[PDB]
């Protein structure tokens, strides 16, 4: 606020979808060319994800869609309550 895209790192319990949103919003706010923003995405998006999501994304291999990446990482982090609350 302003935040550098270099500093966006996924929290240990932050859902990967929340991290993708924060990464996108921070990169959108950066005053930079599209070429520089694309290099930042290629260099930082997976690299700054948390260890559990990096493990999953490494196993997916290159060329996944963002939908495939978010579906693969959906179970990491987020709410800690897993049992029948209801």
């Amino acid at each position, epitope marked *: 606020s302003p935040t*550098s895209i*270099l*500093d966006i790192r996924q929290g240990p319990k932050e859902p990967f979808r929340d991290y993708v949103d924060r990464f996108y919003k921070t990169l959108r706010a950066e005053q*930079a060319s599209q070429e*520089v923003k694309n290099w*930042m995405t290629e*260099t*930082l998006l997976v*690299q700054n994800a948390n260890p559990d999501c990096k493990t999953i994304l490494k196993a997916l291999g290159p060329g996944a869609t963002l939908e495939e990446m978010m579906t693969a990482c959906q179970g990491v982090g987020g709410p800690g309550h897993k049992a029948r609350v209801l």
Partner: nanobody, 114 residues
Framework: AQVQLVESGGGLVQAGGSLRLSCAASGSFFMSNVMAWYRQAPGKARELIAAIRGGDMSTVYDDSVKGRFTITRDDDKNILYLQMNDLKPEDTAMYYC??????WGQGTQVTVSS
């Protein structure tokens, strides 16, 4: 944000001149994989003009500095550099470096006359 940065190398030059900016990282024997240079002129947002990643040494530049500026990193000294050639009055700004998770430095002023 633990690693501390500090820029040097700015000054007043005539159009067509050259400067070499240095950014010294302290607080670690190492620097983050990605580092960048930002340009900030009065009344404007900071602009991400050059970046580098360790390992493959890939770099990227804003179109306004292509063919004139070069970003390099020396991990044996913990210094990031910006070689600025063929300076233009529109390059006048405060220049700041950044590393992932680092604190911000005080920047260095570059003033280009004509």
């Amino acid at each position: 944000a633990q690693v501390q940065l500090v820029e040097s190398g700015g000054g007043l030059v005539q159009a067509g001149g050259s400067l070499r900016l240095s950014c010294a990282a302290s607080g670690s024997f190492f620097m983050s994989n990605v580092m960048a240079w930002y340009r900030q002129a009065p009344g404007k947002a900071r602009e991400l003009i050059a970046a580098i990643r360790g390992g493959d040494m890939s770099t990227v530049y804003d179109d306004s500095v292509k063919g004139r500026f070069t970003i390099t990193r020396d991990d044996d000294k913990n210094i990031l550099y910006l070689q600025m050639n063929d300076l233009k009055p529109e390059d006048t700004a405060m220049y700041y470096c950044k590393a992932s998770g680092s604190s911000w430095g005080q920047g260095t002023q570059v003033t280009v006359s004509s």
